[PDB]
Assembly symmetry: C2
Homo-oligomer: 446 residues x 2
């Protein structure tokens, strides 16, 4: 009756119900998937994922202007999808680049990020020919210049700014002095010094500016102020170097944080609308300081992976726990835990969970979804509702685990990484194996 | 200044060189890094064993001290626990698997968890584990059926909610504890379970279990939790006679025994704390006309933990403006929330020290920070660092042997650090560092 609704903004785009009531994506009952591949189980609506890539690219005007943030989720399958849809790939560490490359991701379309790039990570990057690197310290700059000189090239490059804006959901914060590890403060002059240094080198080309201001951003208001501040730096730069030189700073990358719906209440604007406001502020602001509007880049992770994937669990214990003299909370324990979605513990994230293996007529009862580890804080969905006849053996699913869940997974209490599976049109295909005690034990020595 | 290495915090066999490099078990940390890489976990093996011994003594027997494998586990460690006479609490299908691959005596394994699978329970009676601490009415059915099918009578404790949560020098009491483990005494769910276990032919009740906290520095919480637990025992004499309730011979007050993360952390010496604890189990027992039951305790952190250190190489130093007039020194490092997530996840606080040389520079306020693309990737939120700290320098964070490695992740595709043990003069790789081959190993 009430828990039977599967809100189309939360759950993947190809999700539907059986005639027997079972929940399907891409036409596959979740039961079949569970019985075939085990639980816990990650289930990626492949068509959804591409769907998001096309949609975002259309909104910003080309896949060249949308870099998938690999940090949300990465494996060779997904890299290949991103290539095919024509987006770029932002990679973060040595290893994210390694796997990008292993999947033959076109290096010209990679951008490298990080607060502490090593000389090896940077050297590997120029060898492969990555093409954009977003620099983050003055040390990085001295380091990359040496490396690109040593290798015969001029490495295009952006500098990362700290612009004093933090945005989440329908609000933002502005600070005099942003206190965090990334970027170079515009207000402090650190950013300008960075611009100066790169212009000065023989071996780097300054090509853009990068800002990132938060996550689950549902209004443009924060971006607007950020872009204001960011393009104000550009004004400082016409100041010293002239308009002709500063046009070479052709790309304003406004970072990630494009929002999705974890709960049906969540109301991120449709992406084309947002992007058109974004485009317009980059333009108003651009010309009211005497410049050609530079090209807008955006780096979603969550808004691309994320909605299209679902973690599929089997209920194993149901305990009814007294929380007042009169009331109860219905703890439903499950197959996995913080080993595969640590976001609830770590960020206080809020998820939708649903019985999926059947349809119940029972009245909804307040509940906590809870995993299998020896920590009381091992909690996947802190507050929901759940049909009062929920019972071991049932299959439940949590609704936007596509982003930052698997990437964050651990082997806490020796629980191995769930399998991951992709699904497209009717067909299912294992993408990522499930761990076994052999993996568990495989770093041990004699 | 930042030069003191507080002996309550750092591993026991920690030392300084003539040249001022920090050493443990006689090995300079520079050498370890140059041999094995960074980031690196470094286990002072004698420390671990020392704490095994010290705890055992305090509670009368290694048998009354069960190591909590959740805090860190591998065959090597399983093997240290076996050799020091302690037991092993394991939590999941996987933790038993490895304890067994390491040939840990099953008599000395206790098995925990809110949501044991049929298949987990089955594996464990087949291995002859010996104690299971049941958590749900459902689990009790499952386990009767299973032990019956095996032709055995499986010893068992039940786990209780007793409405106490202790941390540091305080604790909260609650009319109705609101969390996943245990069965409530006050609702009489506990007593319902004691009935149903007395009723089966295939289970046999030998104790009660409460776990009430972490980083516990007073006895007070334990006193109240004990009062309340043994309260159940009285209720069972009421129903069953004192002569069949004495079969419930074991009161297990769980883990939570505390260590020093920071120098100002001041947990009591375990010998005192256990004396105190033993007295009150006794008092509270005779206070209800029962034989003193045996006190068992299930530490993880207090055993693993203080003897292990995470060695990092500095990569980036950045002065960050935080007011018109102040600055915070962001020192970034080889690793991050991938190998130490406790800071982001629980708001833990750590000590960190410059370790590859000794600086005469003055101290400056700082943040030790990882290399992952997330601004919350912070290893140590508020420390002090010497003002001439500089890339190339090696720092160590100070009590990382518990919960850090077991929670490790491959975030941003950062492989697990290697783990190395050092024992009188001598290093030895135990767990090896992950490679992109590992990172790719689940792909098809």
């Amino acid at each position: 009756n009430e828990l039977l609704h599967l809100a189309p903004n939360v759950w993947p785009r190809n999700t539907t119900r059986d005639e027997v009531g079972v929940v399907c994506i891409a036409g596959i009952p979740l039961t079949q998937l569970a019985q075939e591949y085990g639980t816990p189980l990650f289930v990626i609506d492949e068509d959804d994922f591409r769907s998001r890539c096309r949609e975002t690219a259309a909104a910003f005007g080309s896949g060249a202007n949308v870099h998938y943030a690999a940090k949300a989720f990465l494996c060779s399958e997904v890299a290949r999808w991103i290539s095919e849809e024509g987006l770029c790939l932002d990679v973060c560490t040595g290893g994210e680049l390694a796997v990008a490359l292993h999947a033959s991701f076109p290096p010209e379309r990679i951008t490298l990020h990080g607060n502490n790039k090593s000389v090896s990570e940077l050297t590997a990057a120029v060898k492969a020919g990555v093409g954009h690197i977003v620099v983050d310290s003055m040390t990085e700059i001295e380091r990359l210049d040496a490396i690109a000189g040593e290798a015969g090239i001029v490495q295009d490059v952006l500098v990362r700014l700290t612009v004093g804006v933090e945005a989440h959901t329908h609000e933002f914060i502005s600070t005099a002095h942003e206190d965090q590890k990334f970027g170079l403060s515009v207000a402090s002059g650190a950013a300008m010094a960075a611009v100066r240094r790169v212009f000065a080198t023989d071996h780097l080309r300054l090509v853009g500016l990068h800002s990132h201001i938060g996550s689950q951003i549902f209004d443009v208001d924060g971006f607007e102020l950020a872009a204001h501040r960011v393009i104000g730096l550009l004004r400082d730069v016409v100041g010293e170097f002239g308009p002709e030189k500063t046009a070479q700073i052709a790309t304003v990358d406004l970072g990630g944080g494009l929002g999705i719906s974890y709960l049906p209440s969540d109301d991120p604007p449709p992406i084309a609308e947002l992007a058109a406001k974004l485009g317009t502020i980059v333009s108003d602001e651009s010309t009211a300081v005497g410049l050609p509007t530079p090209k807008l880049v955006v780096e979603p992770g969550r808004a691309i992976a994320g909605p299209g994937t679902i973690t599929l669990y089997e209920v194993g214990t149901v305990k009814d726990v007294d929380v007042s003299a009169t009331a109860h909370r219905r703890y439903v324990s499950v197959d996995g835990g913080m080993s595969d979605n640590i976001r609830t513990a770590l960020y206080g994230a809020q998820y939708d969970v649903r019985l999926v293996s059947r349809v119940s007529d029972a009245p909804p009862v307040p509940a906590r979804l809870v995993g299998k580890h020896c920590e009381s804080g091992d909690i996947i969905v802190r507050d929901t509702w759940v049909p009062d006849d929920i019972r071991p053996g049932d299959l439940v699913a949590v609704a936007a685990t596509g982003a930052y869940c698997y990437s964050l997974s651990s082997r806490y209490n020796m629980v191995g990484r769930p399998a991951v599976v992709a699904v497209h049109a009717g067909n299912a295909r294992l993408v990522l194996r499930r761990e076994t005690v052999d993996d568990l034990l495989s770093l041990e020595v004699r």
